[PDB]
Each structure stands twice: as structure tokens, then as C-alpha cells.
From a paper:
The crystal of RmSBP soaked with HgCl2 (RmSBP-Hg) belongs to the monoclinic P21 space group with the unit cell parameters a = 92.84, b = 97.86, c = 101.98 Å, and β = 90°, containing two RmSBP molecules in the asymmetric unit, which is a new crystal form and diffracted up to 2.0 Å. The two RmSBP-Hg molecules in the asymmetric unit clearly showed an electron density map for building all amino acids from Glu27 to Leu182. The crystal structure of RmSBP-Hg showed a strong positive Fo–Fc electron density (>7 sigma) on the Cys145 in the loop between the α5-helix and β5-stand, which surrounds the α5-and α6-helices. Hg2+ interacted with Cys145 and a water molecule at an average distance of 2.57 and 2.27 Å, respectively. Hg2+ was surrounded by Ile122, Thr126, Val132, Val163, and Met167 residues. In the RmSBP-Hg-A molecule, Hg2+ was buried by neighboring amino acids, but in the surface structure of the RmSBP-Hg-B molecule, the conformations of the amino acids around Hg2+ were slightly different, and Hg2+ was observed through the hole in the surface structure. The Cys145 of RmSBP, where Hg2+ bound, was located on the side of the α/β domain, which is different from the previously expected substrate-binding site. The Cys145 with Hg2+ binding in RmSBP is conserved in RpSBP but has been replaced by proline in the other SBPs. This result indicates that Hg2+ may not be directly involved in the biological function of SBP. Accordingly, the mercury associated with RmSBP-Hg is most likely a result of the affinity between Hg2+ and cysteine due to atomic properties, rather than biological function.
Residue numbers in the entry: 27 to 182
Write the structure that this text describes.
């Protein structure tokens, strides 16, 4: 498992200057009590504002995404897991479609998202953390791979 503070620090280097990121979090996902204050401390360690929009059903996904954009002006979407609601194609395809229309990058929990249009995911290696990047989409959305990570970055 790549930890949230590890993902946010990777996000800071992949999208330099990012200031506001939005998280769609399934309220039913386990470890909610551990993950949400985890996100806020990663936010304080990075200087990136992390707005968390929780969803309990598929119906809540669209209003919560739109609220993140209209009221919080997030510049990217961050999805941490997909064990329940966020693993259903209806929620994934919406989040990917509309983030793509808004020109914002999506940091995703598995390669399935990158095959559908998301920008970046990650996996823990013997060597630490390796990046997986959809190049053509990530390039177009302002993602830059630091040379310190060019070696340890696969391109879907
Ligand atoms: Hg994207």
C-alpha cells in the first residue's frame, strides 16, 4: 500500500504548483477513521488543500463532484480506493468523463482507471513506489514526470 501522504507528495511533484485537490471518498469504505485525518495532515505537510467529498450512493457522486468544482475550485481529482462504490463502472466512468471535460488530472487507485482515461496511479515496489502514467492524457493535462522518477515510471 502506498500511503496517502506518500501519494500527495508524489502529486505535488507530478503537478507542480497544485493548490487545491478534491477527493471523492466512499463513506462505506473501511478505515474511514484512519484515512480522513490522514488526508488532512498530508495536506498540512504538502501545502495542498485537500477537500473531501463523501458519497454514500451512486446518486451522490455527480452532485459531490460538481460541488468540489463549483464551490472549492479543485484542480485535480484524487480517488484513494475502489472496494465498494468507487469500483462500480457507473461511478468511475462519470468521474473520468467529467474530470476530462474540466481538463483536470485524475490520480487513480488502479490501472483500470488509466485504461479508461485517468492520468496517474501507483504501486509499491521492492524499490519503493513506482508510477504508472497514461502519457498522452497526462501530458495533455499538465503532468510532468520528475527525472528522479523517469526510471521508475511505467507508461500505460
Ligand atoms: Hg486525466
Amino acid at each position: 500500500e502506498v500511503t496517502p501522504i506518500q501519494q500527495l507528495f508524489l502529486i505535488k511533484e507530478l503537478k507542480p504548483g497544485i493548490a487545491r485537490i478534491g477527493v471523492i471518498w466512499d463513506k462505506n469504505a473501511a478505515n474511514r477513521d484512519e484515512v480522513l485525518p490522514q488526508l488532512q495532515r498530508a495536506s498540512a505537510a504538502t501545502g495542498i488543500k485537500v477537500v473531501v467529498a463523501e458519497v454514500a450512493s451512486l446518486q451522490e457522486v455527480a452532485p459531490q463532484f460538481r460541488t468540489l468544482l463549483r464551490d472549492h475550485q479543485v484542480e485535480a481529482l484524487w480517488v484513494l480506493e475502489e472496494s465498494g462504490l468507487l469500483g462500480q463502472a457507473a461511478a468511475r466512468s462519470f468521474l473520468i468523463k467529467n474530470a476530462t471535460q474540466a481538463g483536470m488530472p485524475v490520480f487513480a487507485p488502479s490501472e483500470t482507471w488509466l485504461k479508461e482515461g485517468a492520468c496517474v496511479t501507483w504501486r509499491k515496489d521492492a524499490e519503493g513506489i513506482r508510477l504508472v502514467v497514461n502519457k498522452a492524457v497526462a501530458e495533455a493535462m499538465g503532468i510532468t514526470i520528475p527525472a528522479k522518477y523517469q526510471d521508475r515510471t511505467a507508461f500505460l
